[PDB]
Design goal:
heterodimer; A: 9 strands; B: 1125 residues; alpha+beta; Rossmann fold; eight-stranded parallel beta sheet; 34 strands; 43% helix; elongated; binds ligand IP9; binds a molecule of 3 linked components (NAG-NAG-BMA); binds 2-acetamido-2-deoxy-beta-D-glucopyranose; binds magnesium ion; membrane protein; lipid transporter autoinhibition P-type ATPase P4-ATPase CDC50A; dimeric; Cell cycle control protein 50A; Phospholipid-transporting ATPase IC
C-alpha cells in the first residue's frame, strides 16, 4: 500500500471553531435572555389581562340553576335560560365558543375512529367505510355517511343570546356560523362526495350516524355549509389536544356603527339542551371573547416568561459571582 | 533447578511419504483428511458460514434481541399496529449494514492470506522441480528453498549447497533469538540426494510424532534404502525459519498448514468485544426493564381509568364488552409499541458507522505511515476503537518490535583508555566531528560510522602495539565464516555480536580473510599473515566465553579469549595494571546500555601446550561425555590471562522506542516486555529502552520465588515491597513456570491443587503489578499468552499486545487489542492482529490520539444518543395522564418514523467522527489526558443514568410548557391551533430544536459539516413536513403564541444545561479544560532527553552488562571439516 492522501478530512485537521464556555460568552446570554423575557412576559401578561372574556357554565349538574330540569329530559326538546351581565361592553369581533370539560377527544380509541378518505369526498370510500370507524360503520344495511365515534358524538346544542334593553324585549344577536373552520379543512381536507348537484342524490344508499337526529343532507340550508363541509361538523372533527377544550361556535362581527358589538347590560343565553355529558362528570360552557392581535388570552405564557426571565437574570448573577469567586 | 538458558516447550503415529501424494491420501487417513494442506486460514466467513455465524455474533448485542422481540410483538394481530411487512425490513436493513461492514473486513483479510499462499516455493510434482504456490504443498512433497526464503512448512532437511548438507536458519520469528542455528542432515541423505534428478525418484517413509507444539525437540524415524534412520530436531526446519547463508536447501515436507509446530502454538481465535460493547448491553437491558415497568404502570392506570371514567363515557363506546382489567392488559402492549423508540433502531448502525469512520482515520494517518518500508497503519478490525483509549497494560516483544535487529560496534576500552568518543587528532576538539576516513584501508567499507580519529592514528602509528593486538583478537577469536565468491569478502556471522566485532575489526585494518580446518589467514594493515589454529575453545551458555589457541608464523603459541567480564576477571593474571581502569570502562559502557565483552590473552610455552594438547585430544575423542570432559580441559588452560580491554556493541532500538515508553508512562500505561530471547539480551534492551534505570533494583526468578513462598507460608493485601521503592522483574521462562506452579480421592485433591494454583497466580500478578517494569525472557508463545491472561483475569485490565513473528500471535489473539508490527518480510503477527503499523513509536498516536479520541467520541455519542430518545419518547408518557392512559402518541405518525433517522441522525454521527477536545499535537504533549480512559470516567453506569435523567427532565418541559400554554386560550381565531395536530407540531418543533441545540453545546469541534448538520437537521424538519402538508403546520407555526411557546420551551430546556456546563467547568475544570484555557501560553516543550550521565564511584561492578547471542557447536564444525568446503 501507498502513502495516504494528505487531505484535511483524512488527517483530522478540518478547519474548525473551538467554542469555550467562557464567562464572556455565557454570562451575557443569561442576561440578554433575562432582559428580553421580562418585557415579553410583561407584554403577554398585560395584553391577555386587557382581553374581556365571560365564561358561562350551563351543564346544569347542580340544583338551584335554571338548567337542571334538562339533566333528565323527559321530553327530548329541553331549554335553559341562563342570565348573565357584562360589566364592560365588548368591542371588535366577538367569538363564541362551547367548552367541554373532562371530554377526552384525544383518547386513542376515539381519535382514530374516523375515515379520512370518506370525508375527503371519495366515491369508493363512501359506501365502504374503513374498519377504523368499525362500531359505527353500518347502522342497519347501509353505511354511515360520517362514520366513526368522532362524527357520531357531535356537539348538538343550539346556543342563542338575547340582549335585554330598557324595554326588556329580548333583542336577538346576530351570529355568523360561516368561516369558523380551518380554511384548509373547509376546502382541502373535507369535501362533499362528487356526482350530481343536490346532496340528496350524492349520498345515495347511506344512512345517518346512529346518534344524529337528522342526516347530513340538511345540516344547513346553504349548499355551501351542508354535507361533509359543514362548519360545525368540521370544527368538531378537529379533535382537541387535552380533555378540557373549547371549539369555535359563532362569530359576532363588529357593528357597522361605532357602538360596541355587545353593549354592557343584561343578557340571556337560550340553549337547547341536547348533548348529555353529566354521566362522565363533564361540564359544558359558553365562552365569549374579543379579538386580540396577540392571539388570545394566555396569562400562563406571561407568567412563564417572567419566571424564566427572573431565573435567567438571577442565574447570571449567581454565575457572575461564582466566576469572580473562582477567578 | 530451573534452567535460565532454555525455552520450556515441554511444560505446555504420523506417516509421510515422498513424491507419493496418492498413498497418504487413502480413505483410512481421510476423516469426515487427517493431513492438512499447506494453506493457512485466518478469515472467518469462507463461503456459506457467513449467515449462521455473522448473525450469531450479531445477536451478541442486547438491542438486536430487543428489536427482535418488538418484531414478534408487532406481528400479533390483536395488538399489531403495523402491517409486519415493513417492520422487519428496518431490522434487516440495519443488520445488513453491520454484516456488510463485517464482510469488507473479512475479504480484506482473505486477500491478506492469499499473499502468504502465493509465496511460490519450488516443489517436485513432475520429473523435475516446478515452481508452486505455498498452498500447493501437501505432506510429503520434496521442495527446494534458496537464500532468505521462508520455510513453507516443517521439512526434513535432505541436502543443501553447504558441505555435509548444512543449513543455517535464523529463528527470530519462531523465537526472539537473533542468531543463526545450523541444521545438519543424515549422512546417507547427504550423499545420495544431492543432484536434482535423484530427489524426484526419492521414495522414503517417515514415521514421526503426531503434530505438536514442541519446537525444541522432534522424534521420528526414516525408513529408506532398507534401513531405519532416526531423526531429531537438528534435521527439521520449522515453518517460520528463514534460510541464511545457504544457496539452496532441499527438504521433505513433514507437516503443513495448521499442523506445523509453530501454527499449533498459535492460540485460539476469539471474538473480541469492547468494554463499552458490554456497557451498551447492560444499558439496553436497563431500558428494557424500565420500558416494561412504565408500560405496566400506565396499563394499570388505564384500567383504573376505564373503570370509572371510560365506562361512563358514552362517546367512548366501541361495541366490545371488555372489562377494565382486560383493557388495561391490552394497552400494556400498546405502550410497548409507543415507548419502544426509547432505544431506537439506529443505535448500532450509528456505532457501526462511527467505528468504521474512526478506524479509517488510523488507516489514513500520515504520522503513522512508515515511508522507508512504504507501510501505513491498518485497523484491520473496525469494531475495537474506543478500547484503544482504555488500555491499561502493553505486552511487547523485543526482537523486531523494540529493536531493528542491527548491532553496531560503538566503543572499546584499551589499556584503560576508552575509544569511541567524538574526537579528532590526538585530543578532543569539538563535538561536531566528521566521520573517520577508512579510505586508507583496502578492505574497509562505509557501513561503520566511527567518530574518533585518535584511535586511527594509534592503529596506524603503532607506538602502542596493544591497540593492534586488541583488534587482531577480534579478528581471530571469532568463529564466523567468510565468502569471497567474487572478491567481495562478505562475512557470514552466526552471532550478531561476532559479526559486529569482526566487521568492526576489519574496517580498522585487521581483516579476517580465509579460514581452514587448521589455519586462519587474518591480514593486518595490508600484511597477509596466516596463523595456525591449534584449538578453538567453543562457547556455551554456562561458559560465557570463547577462546582460541593459535601459533603465530614465527612459531610462538598464543591464546586469545573474549567473554563475560565476570568469568574473565576470575581468570586474570595477578599482575594486571589495566584491571582497575578496564573495570571502570565496563561500568561506563554498562551505564550507557551497551553489550560488553572483555578481551584477554596469555602466553603459552611449547612444552606447556604439549602436555595440555594430549589432554585436550583425549577430551575431544572421548564421545561418552565429550562436552563435559572438554569443559575440564578448557578450564585447565584459561588460568592466567592478560587483560587487553573491552568492547561495546550497541543493539539498535527502533527509533522512538525510548520516547514512546516514557510518554506512555505518563499516560499511566504499564509496559511489559515478554520476549523469547536470552536473559542478558532481554535485560540489556530493558536498559536501552529506559524501562530499567540505575534507580531500579532488579529481582530475578530466584528472588520472586522466595517472596511468594513467604506469603504462601504466612497464610498457612500486604505489599511485597515497600511502597516508595523502585523495582523491576526479569523472570525467565523456566522460572515463570516454577513460580506459577506450572511445571473419590483422585478428584478431591484436585480442588486443593487448583485452589493452590489459583492463589499462586493471583499472588504473582500482585507482585508483578507492583513493579515499575517486568521483563519475561525465554518464554514460549503459550507462556506469552498466559501472562496476558493472568493480567486480564486477576487485574481486570485492558491489555495490548504488540509484536511480530509467529511467537507473538498467541498473545496478540489473547490480548484485548492486538497490534502487529508490519513492514517486514514476516507477516504472521500482522494477519492475526487487530491493528498493524510498521513501527513501535507509532503507538503514541494510536493510543494518545486515535484511542483517546475514540473513547471521548464514542462516550459523547452514547451520552447524547440516550438523551435525544428519552426526551422524544417520554412525551408519550406524560401525555398519558391527559388522554386517559390510552397510548395516544403526542406526535404525528410521520414524525415518529423520521425523527430517529432524519431529524437527529446526522448531527451525532459527525460528532462521533470529528470531535476533538485538544489538538493531536497537544494530546501527545500531554499524555496525562489519557488516564480519563483508564478509569472509565467519561461514561460510567452513573453517567448513563444522568443522561437518562437529562432526557426525563427535558421531556417534562417539552410537554408541560406547550400544555400550560394550551390549557388556556392560544391564538383562538378562525384558524385556531388549539387542537391535537397543533399540539403535536409544537412539541415536535420544540423537541427538534432542543435536541439539535444540545448537540451544538456538546460539540467542541465545530467543523462546517458539524454546523451544517446541526442546522441542516433543524431546517430539514421545518421544510420536509411542509411537503406532507394535512395542513397542520401551515397554521400552527404562523401564530405568535405557537412561537412564543416554542422559544420558551427551548430556553427552559437549554439554559439550565448551559449553567451546569459552565459551573462544572469553572469549579471543577477537567484536564482538557485547563489545557484549552492556556493553549496559547504553552510554549516550553523540550524533546525527550536520555540520561546523559549516571556516573558513580564506590562499587567495583554494580551491574554486569555482558550480553552475547551465540550457540554451541560452531567450533566443532571448524575443528572438523563440516563447515569447510
Ligand atoms: C434547574 C435544576 C436542574 C439541575 C439538575 C441537577 C443536576 C443534574 O443532574 O443534571 C441533569 C442533566 C445533566 O446533564 P449533563 O450531562 O450536561 O451534566 C453534566 C455536565 O455535562 C458536566 O460537564 P461534562 O463533564 O459533561 O463536560 C459534568 O461534569 P462533571 O462530571 O465533571 O461533574 C457533570 O457530571 P456529574 O453530574 O458530576 O456526574 C454533569 O453536571 O441535565 C441538566 O443538567 C439539567 C436538565 C434539567 C433542565 C431543567 C429542569 C427544570
Ligand atoms: C344529540 O346528541 C346526543 C348524543 O350525541 C343524542 O343522544 C343519543 O340519541 C340516540 C338516538 O337519538 C340514542 O341512540 C339510541 O336511541 C334509541 C331510541 O331510538 C335507544 O332506544 C337506544 O338505547 C339508543 O339510546 C343514544 O343513546 C343517545 N345518546 C345519549 C348519550 O343520550 C341526541 O339524540 C342528539 N339530539 C339531537 C337533536 O341531535
Ligand atoms: C332570567 O331572565 C329572564 C328574562 O330574561 C327572567 O324571566 C327570569 O326571571 C330570570 N331568572 C333569574 C334566575 O334571574
Ligand atoms: C329559546 O329558543 C327556542 C328555540 O328556538 C324558542 O322556542 C324559545 O322561544 C326561546 N326562548 C326561550 C326558551 O325563552
Ligand atoms: Mg519478534
Amino acid at each position: 500500500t501507498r502513502r495516504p492522501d494528505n487531505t484535511a478530512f483524512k488527517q483530522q485537521r478540518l478547519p474548525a471553531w473551538q467554542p469555550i464556555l467562557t464567562a464572556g460568552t455565557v454570562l451575557p446570554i443569561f442576561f440578554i435572555i433575562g432582559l428580553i423575557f421580562i418585557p415579553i412576559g410583561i407584554g403577554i401578561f398585560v395584553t391577555s389581562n386587557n382581553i374581556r372574556e365571560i365564561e358561562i357554565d350551563y351543564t346544569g349538574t347542580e340544583p338551584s340553576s335554571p338548567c337542571n330540569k334538562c339533566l333528565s329530559p323527559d321530553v327530548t326538546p329541553c331549554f335553559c335560560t341562563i342570565n348573565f351581565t357584562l360589566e364592560k361592553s365588548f368591542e371588535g369581533n366577538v367569538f363564541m365558543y362551547y367548552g367541554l370539560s373532562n371530554f377526552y377527544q384525544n383518547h386513542r380509541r376515539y381519535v382514530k375512529s374516523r375515515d379520512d378518505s370518506q370525508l375527503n369526498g371519495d366515491s369508493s370510500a363512501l359506501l365502504n367505510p374503513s374498519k377504523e370507524c368499525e362500531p359505527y360503520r353500518r347502522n342497519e344495511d347501509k353505511p354511515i355517511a360520517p362514520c366513526g365515534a368522532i362524527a357520531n358524538s357531535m356537539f348538538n346544542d343550539t346556543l342563542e343570546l338575547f340582549l335585554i334593553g330598557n324595554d326588556s324585549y329580548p333583542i336577538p344577536i346576530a351570529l355568523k356560523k360561516k368561516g369558523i373552520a380551518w380554511w384548509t379543512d373547509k376546502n382541502v381536507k373535507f369535501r362533499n362526495p362528487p356526482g350530481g348537484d343536490n346532496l340528496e342524490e350524492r349520498f345515495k344508499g347511506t344512512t345517518k350516524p346512529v346518534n344524529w337526529l337528522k342526516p347530513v343532507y340538511m345540516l344547513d340550508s346553504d349548499p355551501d355549509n351542508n354535507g361533509f363541509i359543514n362548519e360545525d361538523f368540521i370544527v368538531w372533527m378537529r379533535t382537541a389536544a387535552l380533555p378540557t377544550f373549547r371549539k369555535l361556535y359563532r362569530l359576532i362581527e363588529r357593528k357597522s356603527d361605532l357602538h360596541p358589538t355587545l353593549p354592557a347590560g343584561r343578557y340571556s343565553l337560550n340553549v337547547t339542551y341536547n348533548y348529555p355529558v353529566h354521566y362522565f362528570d363533564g361540564r359544558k360552557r359558553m365562552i365569549l371573547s374579543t379579538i386580540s392581535w396577540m392571539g388570545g388570552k394566555n396569562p400562563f405564557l406571561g407568567i412563564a416568561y417572567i419566571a424564566v426571565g427572573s431565573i435567567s437574570f438571577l442565574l447570571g448573577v449567581v454565575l457572575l459571582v461564582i466566576n469572580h469567586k473562582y477567578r | 533447578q530451573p534452567n535460565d538458558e532454555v525455552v520450556p516447550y515441554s511444560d505446555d503415529t504420523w506417516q509421510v511419504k515422498a513424491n507419493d501424494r496418492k498413498y497418504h491420501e487413502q480413505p483410512h487417513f481421510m476423516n469426515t483428511s487427517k493431513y492438512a494442506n499447506n494453506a493457512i486460514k485466518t478469515y472467518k466467513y469462507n463461503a456459506f458460514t457467513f449467515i449462521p455465524m455473522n448473525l450469531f455474533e450479531q445477536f451478541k448485542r442486547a438491542a438486536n434481541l430487543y428489536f427482535l422481540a418488538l418484531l414478534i410483538l408487532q406481528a400479533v394481530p390483536q395488538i399489531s399496529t403495523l402491517a409486519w411487512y415493513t417492520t422487519l425490513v428496518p431490522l434487516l436493513v440495519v443488520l445488513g449494514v453491520t454484516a456488510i461492514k463485517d464482510l469488507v473486513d473479512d475479504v480484506a483479510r482473505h486477500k491478506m492470506d492469499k499473499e502468504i499462499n502465493n509465496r511460490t516455493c519450488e516443489v517436485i510434482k513432475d520429473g523435475r522441480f516446478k515452481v508452486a504456490k505455498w498452498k500447493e504443498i501437501q505432506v510429503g512433497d520434496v521442495i527446494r528453498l534458496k537464500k532468505n526464503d521462508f520455510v513453507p512448512a516443517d521439512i526434513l532437511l535432505l541436502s543443501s549447497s553447504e558441505p555435509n548438507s548444512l543449513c543455517y536458519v535464523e529463528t527470530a520469528e519462531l523465537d526472539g533469538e537473533t542468531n543463526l542455528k545450523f541444521k545438519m542432515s543424515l549422512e546417507i541423505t547427504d550423499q545420495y540426494l544431492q543432484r536434482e534428478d535423484t530427489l524426484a525418484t526419492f521414495d522414503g517413509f517417515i514415521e514421526c510424532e503426531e503434530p505438536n507444539n514442541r519446537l525444541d525437540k522432534f522424534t521420528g524415524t526414516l525408513f529408506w534404502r532398507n534401513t531405519s534412520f532416526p531423526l531429531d530436531a537438528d534435521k527439521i526446519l520449522l515453518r517460520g525459519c528463514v534460510i541464511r547463508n545457504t544457496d539452496f536447501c532441499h527438504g521433505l515436507v513433514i507437516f503443513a498448514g495448521a499442523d506445523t509446530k509453530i501454527m499449533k502454538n498459535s492460540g485460539k481465535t476469539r471474538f473480541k468485544r469492547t468494554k463499552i460493547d458490554y456497557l451498551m448491553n447492560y444499558m439496553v437491558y436497563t431500558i428494557f426493564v424500565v420500558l416494561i415497568l412504565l408500560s405496566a404502570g400506565l396499563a394499570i392506570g388505564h384500567a383504573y381509568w376505564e373503570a370509572q371514567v371510560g365506562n361512563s363515557s358514552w362517546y367512548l363506546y366501541d361495541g366490545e364488552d371488555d372489562t377494565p382489567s382486560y383493557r388495561g392488559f391490552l394497552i400494556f402492549w400498546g405502550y410497548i409499541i409507543v415507548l419502544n423508540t426509547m432505544v431506537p433502531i439506529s443505535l448500532y448502525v450509528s456505532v457501526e458507522v462511527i467505528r468504521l469512520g474512526q478506524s479509517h482515520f488510523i488507516n489514513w494517518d500520515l504520522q503513522m505511515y512508515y515511508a522507508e518500508k512504504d507501510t501505513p497503519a491498518k485497523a484491520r478490525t473496525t469494531t475495537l476503537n474506543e478500547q484503544l483509549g482504555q488500555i491499561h497494560y502493553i505486552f511487547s516483544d523485543k526482537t523486531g518490535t523494540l529493536t531493528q535487529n542491527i548491532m553496531t560496534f560503538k566503543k572499546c576500552c584499551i589499556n584503560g583508555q576508552i575509544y569511541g568518543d567524538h574526537r579528532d587528532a590526538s585530543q578532543h576538539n569539538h563535538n561536531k566531528i566528521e566521520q573517520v576516513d577508512f579510505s586508507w584501508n583496502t578492505y574497509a567499507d562505509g557501513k561503520l560510522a566511527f567518530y574518533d580519529h585518535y584511535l586511527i592514528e594509534q592503529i596506524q602509528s603503532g607506538k602502542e602495539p596493544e591497540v593492534r593486538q586488541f583488534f587482531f583478537l577480534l579478528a581471530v577469536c571469532h568463529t564466523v565464516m567468510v565468502d569471497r565468491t567474487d572478491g567481495q569478502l562478505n562475512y557470514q556471522a552466526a552471532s550478531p555480536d561476532e559479526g559486529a566485532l569482526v566487521n568492526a575489526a576489519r574496517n580498522f585494518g585487521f581483516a579476517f580473510l580465509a579460514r581452514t580446518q587448521n589455519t586462519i589467514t587474518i591480514s593486518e594493515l595490508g600484511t597477509e599473515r596466516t596463523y595456525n589454529v591449534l584449538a578453538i575453545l567453543d562457547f556455551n551458555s554456562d561458559r560465557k566465553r570463547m577462546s582460541i589457541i593459535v601459533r603465530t608464523p614465527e612459531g610462538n603459541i598464543k591464546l586469545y579469549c573474549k567473554g563475560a567480564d565476570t568469568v574473565i576477571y576470575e581468570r586474570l593474571h595477578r599482575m594486571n595494571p589495566t584491571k582497575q581502569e578496564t573495570q571502570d570502562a565496563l561500568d561506563i559502557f554498562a551505564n550507557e546500555t551497551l553489550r560488553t565483552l572483555c578481551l584477554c590473552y596469555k602466553e603459552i610455552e611449547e612444552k606447556e601446550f604439549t602436555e595440555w594438547n594430549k589432554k585436550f585430544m583425549a577430551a575431544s575423542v572421548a564421545s561418552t561425555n565429550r562436552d563435559e570432559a572438554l569443559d575440564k580441559v578448557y578450564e585447565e588452560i584459561e588460568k592466567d590471562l592478560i587483560l587487553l580491554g573491552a568492547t561495546a556493541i550497541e543493539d539498535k532500538l527502533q527509533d522512538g522506542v525510548p520516547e514512546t515508553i516514557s510518554k506512555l508512562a505518563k499516560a499511566d500505561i504499564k509496559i511489559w516486555v515478554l520476549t523469547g530471547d536470552k536473559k542478558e539480551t532481554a535485560e540489556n534492551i530493558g536498559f536501552a529502552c529506559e524501562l530499567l534505570t540505575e534507580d531500579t533494583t532488579i529481582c530475578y526468578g530466584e528472588d520472586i520465588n522466595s517472596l511468594l513462598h513467604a506469603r504462601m507460608e504466612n497464610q498457612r493485601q500486604e505489599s511485597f515491597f515497600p511502597p516508595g521503592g523502585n523495582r523491576a522483574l526479569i523472570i525467565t521462562g523456566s522460572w515463570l513456570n516454577e513460580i506459577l506452579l506450572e511445571k473419590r480421592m483422585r478428584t478431591q485433591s484436585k480442588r486443593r491443587l487448583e485452589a493452590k494454583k489459583e492463589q499462586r497466580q493471583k499472588n504473582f500478578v500482585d507482585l508483578a503489578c507492583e513493579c515499575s517494569a517486568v521483563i519475561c525472557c525465554r518464554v514460549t508463545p503459550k507462556q506469552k499468552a498466559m501472562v496476558v491472561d493472568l493480567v486480564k483475569r486477576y487485574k481486570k485490565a485492558i491489555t495490548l499486545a504488540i509484536g511480530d513473528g509467529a511467537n507473538d500471535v498467541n498473545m496478540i489473539k489473547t490480548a484485548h487489542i492486538g497490534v502487529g508490527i508490519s513492514g517486514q518480510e514476516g507477516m504472521q503477527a500482522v494477519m492475526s492482529s487487530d491493528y498493524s503499523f510498521a513501527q513501535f513509536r507509532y503507538l503514541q498516536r494510536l493510543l494518545l490520539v486515535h484511542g483517546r479520541w475514540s473513547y471521548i467520541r464514542m462516550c459523547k455519542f452514547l451520552r447524547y444518543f440516550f438523551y435525544k430518545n428519552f426526551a422524544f419518547t417520554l412525551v408519550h408518557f406524560w401525555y398519558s395522564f391527559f388522554n386517559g392512559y390510552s397510548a395516544q402518541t403526542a406526535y404525528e405518525d410521520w414524525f415518529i418514523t423520521l425523527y430517529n433517522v432524519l431529524y437527529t441522525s446526522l448531527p451525532v454521527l459527525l460528532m462521533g467522527l470529528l470531535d476533538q477536545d485538544v489538538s493531536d499535537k497537544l494530546s501527545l504533549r500531554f499524555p496525562g489526558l489519557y488516564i480519563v480512559g483508564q478509569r472509565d470516567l467519561l461514561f460510567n453506569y452513573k453517567r448513563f443514568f444522568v443522561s437518562l435523567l437529562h432526557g426525563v427532565l427535558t421531556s417534562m418541559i417539552l410537554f408541560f410548557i406547550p400544555l400550560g400554554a394550551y390549557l388556556q386560550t392560544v391564538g383562538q381565531d378562525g384558524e385556531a391551533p388549539s387542537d391535537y395536530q397543533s399540539f403535536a407540531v409544537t412539541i415536535a418543533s420544540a423537541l427538534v430544536i432542543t435536541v439539535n441545540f444540545q448537540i451544538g453545546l456538546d460539540t467542541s469541534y465545530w467543523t462546517f459539516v458539524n454546523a451544517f448538520s446541526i442546522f441542516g437537521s433543524i431546517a430539514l424538519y421545518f421544510g420536509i413536513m411542509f411537503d406532507f402538508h394535512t395542513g397542520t403546520a401551515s397554521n400552527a407555526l404562523r401564530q405568535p403564541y405557537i412561537w412564543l411557546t416554542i422559544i420558551l420551551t427551548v430556553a427552559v430546556c437549554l439554559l439550565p444545561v448551559v449553567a451546569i456546563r459552565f459551573l462544572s467547568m469553572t469549579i471543577w475544570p477537567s484536564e482538557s479544560d485547563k489545557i484549552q484555557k492556556h493553549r496559547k501560553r504553552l510554549k516550553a516543550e523540550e524533546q525527550w532527553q536520555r540520561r546523559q550521565q549516571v556516573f558513580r564511584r564506590g562499587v567495583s561492578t554494580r551491574r554486569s552488562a555482558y550480553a552475547f547471542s551465540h550457540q554451541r557447536g560452531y567450533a566443532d564444525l571448524i575443528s572438523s571439516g563440516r563447515s569447510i568446503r
